[PDB]
Structures are given as structure tokens and as C-alpha cells.
């Protein structure tokens, strides 16, 4: 067991209750401080506060409950990153309805394939995705109700979130008396995510509650510090964006988003919103390695730049760190089947080329590619991980599940890795 790498102790113990209960508890607390910003849209410059966000999510929860949705139902949220995206997401977590994020700009075909797995009864969609959802509905009439996200009034005959809510709230509904549903966090699916044809990945509420431990951890996440703002350019419909944003909400952070990358807008949003931490996909890292405009901006509040979800070379990492006058790069590794990152750069413990260390509650090992036997330091082999954020299985695909997770609960990542003397993990790119 000398060669099984173990995750440290979480700074805070893992709270009880569902992921909806934990999100509801914390967002209510932030709702009660007027003017606490939850999301800022850098394109349209509008802020929405925790009070606005909490109340509309609670209203959506109760409206979905009075409509008839329960743990036997799934919704789809199909929308690019927006101020509205997490309203139906939170509302459905509050009542144990599973949420299937759909890749907003997917062509009709991949939308159909994602949604054929997830079998949603109600679809929330932004205006520019409506016609595709309509076409998917022709082939999957289990879709019985379509709700427009970025409207206040009805749009093209369909209810908005706001008119849908007032259609089903009881008289005298009180947003601050509402109690989120209580249920078995291990068996109630919180999210159905699309795999890297893609499979549906069922994630129980428990895996998000573990993520929330990491999110608030001073070592493996962000210190809950007032007036902390994040600038994230990560799609909400994949696991990297989904569970960093849910964690930032748990921490009461200001989540500044852009859904169309622009060099000047991004750098000016870093400066004007006094971003402390910036969240990029690795191909935008490759971009800012080439940028020669960073020195024009006041990035003194910038404490970290973070990457995940795809290979990042050590050289690109160091090049970006230099461009932004930072000691290094914060990084994380995970799979959709893993909920979120299970290898994370601890704060200030950064090492170039490394993806980080095993997170609290998890264990990781490297196994020989021919045998399966546990290798020691620096030996290269397959990365295997085990912990409470592993998915419960692929949706209606038990064989693909078992190919990936053996009877003892190790997940075979299909990646080549090694850990070093200080226990940092490196992912070896096959080519
Ligand atoms: N870091 C890294 N290097 C190289 N290859 C990597 C990689 N991460 C993933 N991969 C490759 O991607 C596939 C799996 O693809 P996927 O689409 O199934 O999913 C993901 O990559 C996705 C699931 S969640 C996730 C990450 N989640 C988080 C969460 C938090 C963080 N941070 C930021 C870092 C610093 C603060 C701590 C929190 C990061 C990430 S990433 N990615 C896999 O096979 C591998 O090949």
C-alpha cells in the first residue's frame, strides 16, 4: 500500500443532506445580504444577485414540484452560458429532479443522441436553441413542455421561466419558507452528463456534496473570502464548468462569465471586475501564450490562473504563467465519470507539468499496462482512481460501466500517468 496515493483530510468534514439542501442553505445565507453578486455577464454587463438567484430558483423548484416532476423525472437545460443557466439547474436539485445539461450549439443530431439517453420530460432552452429542441421533440415526444430561459414574457407561444413559475406556484408562496426536498443522496441522480458516441453519465447527489467539500477547502479549492470574483470561460454543460460553478455558488463568489471568447474583453474583464481567479480551457491557454496585450491591463488582483479538462503541456503552462507574472499555473484532472477534478494542484504547492495531487476522499494508483499490478514512484502505467465522486454508472449501459469500473470500485481512466517523490501526478500524453 506504499504505492497507493491517498487524499489528505478535508479541512471541513463532509456535510449531511443532499446537494440541493447544501446549495439551498448557502444561497439563502447569501440572499440575505443585499447586493451580493452571483453572476455577471461580461458581454451585456448585467449583474444578478444571490437574492434574485435564490428566489427564482426556489420558485422554479416549487413550480416544477406542483407541475409533477419528482425523482422519476429528468429535465434538460440546453443553453450557452448565461445569467439564467443555473436557475433551472438549482431548482431541479432542490427537488431531486435530475438535470441533463445539453451542449447548446450541438447540431440536431448530437442533441437527439444526448437527449435520447436522458429522456427528459421538460426542456429549458434559450431562444436560439428552440427550433432544434422542437425538432428533437418530433422524434422524442416524451418532451411534453418547453420553457424559454432568456425571456420574461412568453416567446413564440412557449412559456418563459417567469410565466411558467406563476402558472404553478400556490397562492401566498413564500420563497424564504420553502424547504428543499430531502432524499437519499446516494440513489437520487443529481446530474446526467455527456461523456467525451457519447454516453450518459449519472452522478448521484453525493458526488456533488463531495465536490462542495473540495470547493471550500483552503488547500484543494478557494478560501471563502469576501468580494472574491471568478472569471470563467468554461462551458457549463460539461463537468469542468458545471461543478466549478456550483462550487463557486456554494462559496458565495461572483461568477463573471463570457460565452464568446474575445482577447480584449477577457483581459479588460480581468482588470475591471478585479478577478482573483481565472478559469480557462487549455486551448485558451495556448492562446494567451501568444498574447502581447496583457501588460496593458491592471491584473494585480489576479492571484491564480487555472486549467483543466484536456492536456496542457508544461511549456505552455510556464509560458502563460510568465505572460501573467504568476509563480505558476493551477491545474486539475478529472473525467466526466469522476464528477469533477480528482487530481488538483494544492494552493501554492504548484509544480510545472503536474496536474496536482489526489484530492480528499480519493485514492489514486498507477498500474502496469500488461499486468494490473501497482507500480511505485516515477513508473509509468495506467491511472486508476477510487473515491465517492465516481459515477453510479452509464445510463442504460451496464456493460460499458463494468468495462471501466472493476468490482472493487477502481476506475480505469485510460490515461498514462506517474507520481513523483512529493506525490504530484503527471499525465503522460500518448500521441
Ligand atoms: N489536466 C488534464 N491533463 C491532461 N488530460 C486531461 C486533463 N483533464 C482531463 N484530461 C483528459 O480528459 C479526459 C476526460 O474528458 P472528460 O470530457 O470526460 O472530462 C473532463 O476532463 C472534465 C471532467 S471534470 C474536469 C475537471 N474538473 C475540474 C474541476 C476543477 C478544476 N479546478 C481547477 C484547477 C485548480 C483549482 C482546483 C479546481 C479542474 C477541473 S477539471 N474535466 C481524460 O481521459 C483525460 O484524457
From Swiss-Prot:
EC number(s) given by UniProt: 1.13.12.7
GO molecular function, one term: ATP binding
Keyword check for Magnesium: yes
Keywords: ATP-binding, Luminescence, Magnesium, Metal-binding, Monooxygenase, Nucleotide-binding, Oxidoreductase, Peroxisome, Photoprotein
Required cofactor(s): Mg(2+)
Domain of life: Eukaryota
Catalytic activity: firefly D-luciferin + ATP + O2 = firefly oxyluciferin + hnu + AMP + CO2 + diphosphate
Protein known as: Luciferin 4-monooxygenase
Native source organism of the sequence: Photinus pyralis
Section covered of the full-length record: 4 to 438 of 550
Amino acid at each position: 500500500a506504499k504505492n497507493i496515493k491517498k487524499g489528505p483530510a478535508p479541512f471541513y468534514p463532509l456535510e449531511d443532506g443532499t446537494a440541493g439542501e447544501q446549495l439551498h442553505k448557502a444561497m439563502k445565507r447569501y440572499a440575505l445580504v443585499p447586493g451580493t453578486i452571483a453572476f455577471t455577464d461580461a458581454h451585456i454587463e448585467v449583474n444578478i444577485t444571490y437574492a434574485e438567484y435564490f428566489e427564482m430558483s426556489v420558485r422554479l423548484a416549487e413550480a416544477m414540484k406542483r407541475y409533477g416532476l419528482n425523482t422519476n423525472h429528468r429535465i434538460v437545460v440546453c443553453s450557452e452560458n448565461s445569467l439564467q443557466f443555473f436557475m433551472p439547474v438549482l431548482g431541479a436539485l432542490f427537488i431531486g429532479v435530475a438535470v441533463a445539461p445539453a451542449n447548446d450549439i450541438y447540431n440536431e443530431r448530437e442533441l437527439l443522441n444526448s437527449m435520447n439517453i436522458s429522456q427528459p420530460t421538460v426542456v429549458f432552452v434559450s431562444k436560439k436553441g428552440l427550433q432544434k429542441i422542437l425538432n428533437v421533440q418530433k422524434k422524442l415526444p416524451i418532451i411534453q413542455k418547453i420553457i424559454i430561459m432568456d425571456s420574461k414574457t412568453d416567446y413564440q407561444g412557449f412559456q418563459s421561466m417567469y410565466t411558467f413559475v406563476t402558472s404553478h406556484l400556490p397562492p401566498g408562496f413564500n420563497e424564504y419558507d420553502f424547504v428543499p426536498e430531502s432524499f437519499d443522496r446516494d440513489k437520487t441522480i443529481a446530474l446526467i452528463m455527456n461523456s467525451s458516441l457519447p454516453k450518459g453519465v449519472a452522478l448521484p447527489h453525493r458526488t456533488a456534496c463531495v465536490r462542495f467539500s473540495h470547493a471550500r477547502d483552503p488547500i484543494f479549492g478557494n478560501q471563502i473570502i469576501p468580494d472574491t470574483a471568478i472569471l470563467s470561460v468554461v462551458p457549463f454543460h460539461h463537468g469542468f464548468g458545471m461543478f466549478t460553478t456550483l462550487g463557486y455558488l456554494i462559496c458565495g463568489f461572483r461568477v463573471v462569465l463570457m460565452y464568446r471568447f474575445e482577447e480584449e474583453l477577457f483581459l479588460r474583464s480581468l482588470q475591471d471586475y478585479k478577478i482573483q481567479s481565472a478559469l480557462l480551457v487549455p486551448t485558451l491557454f495556448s492562446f494567451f501564450a501568444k498574447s502581447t496585450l496583457i501588460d496593458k491591463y491592471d491584473l494585480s488582483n489576479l492571484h491564480e490562473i487555472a486549467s483543466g479538462g484536456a492536456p496542457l503541456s508544461k511549456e505552455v503552462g510556464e509560458a502563460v504563467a510568465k505572460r501573467f507574472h504568476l509563480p505558476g499555473i493551477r491545474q486539475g484532472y478529472g473525467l466526466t465519470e469522476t464528477t469533477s477534478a480528482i487530481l488538483i494542484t494544492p494552493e501554492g504547492d504548484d509544480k510545472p507539468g503536474a496536474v496536482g495531487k489526489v484530492v480528499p476522499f480519493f485514492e489514486a494508483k498507477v498500474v502496469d499496462l500488461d499486468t494490473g499490478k501497482t507500480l511505485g514512484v516515477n513508473q509509468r502505467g495506467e491511472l486508476c482512481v477510487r473515491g465517492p465522486m465516481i459515477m453510479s454508472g452509464y445510463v442504460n449501459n451496464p456493460e460499458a460501466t463494468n468495462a471501466l469500473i472493476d468490482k472493487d470500485g477502481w476506475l480505469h481512466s485510460g490515461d498514462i500517468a506517474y507520481w513523483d517523490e512529493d506525490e504530484h501526478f503527471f499525465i503522460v500524453d500518448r500521441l
